[PDB]
Amino acid sequence: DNMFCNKEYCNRLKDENNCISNLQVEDQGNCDTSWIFASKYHLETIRCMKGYEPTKISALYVANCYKGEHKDRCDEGSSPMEFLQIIEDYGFLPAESNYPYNYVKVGEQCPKVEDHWMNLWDNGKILHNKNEPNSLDGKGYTAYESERFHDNMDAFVKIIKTEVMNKGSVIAYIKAENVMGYEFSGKKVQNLCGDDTADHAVNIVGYGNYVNSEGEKKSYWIVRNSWGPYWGDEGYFKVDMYGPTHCHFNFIHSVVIFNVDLPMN
């Protein structure tokens, strides 16, 4: 456990027995549903950390079940904030097996929950506790932006490492264009700047130290994508945590963590 994930190196995928290593990469297909895949994976790793089986959440249920005006669920992505609202409104997260994903079904009518379906949110609670001496906590999520940490990136890194260790992952936002280069196939540590904005949710799942092609000691994030297991390096990639020195923007735009109460299994 600790030898696979500590403050200097964390790669749970190298422990074939780890619950988290048994959460296989998924393929969102040709809809903008990464917000669902990354958010649900964060709950899946939290469940693993609390001793539950690596059972997948139905992304399709979350895509299709919502209150209010009709939405454009294939063409337009939403946010981790909305993901939590759907949980609050419905109280039920079916398993993938009960309502499995096909991107062509994103937007269809929300299905009836059948009697035999599993609720992977049973005894879960999103926390809205008001603990800090300010009115801004208790939203159910906490978000950090690399631009706000531009003069203190060591603290941004430490926050993410702590959450990866404790929750198994964080949600991270990137600009999808940035991983579209031919070079993102393969096993090298990528090194590049981000943009002013982001549009695609992924997960940071680990990290480590390495030496770059210029002989400099550096560090990388291990990032999970939702473009299937033939994209990148078996569905994941490594990216330099700091990137080129000239960058105005970090490759990681922002991270989100969910604040939930879930009893140990």
Ligand SMILES: [Ca+2]
């Ligand atoms: Ca760019």
Ligand SMILES: [Ca+2]
């Ligand atoms: Ca910006």
Ligand SMILES: [Cl-]
């Ligand atoms: Cl749509």
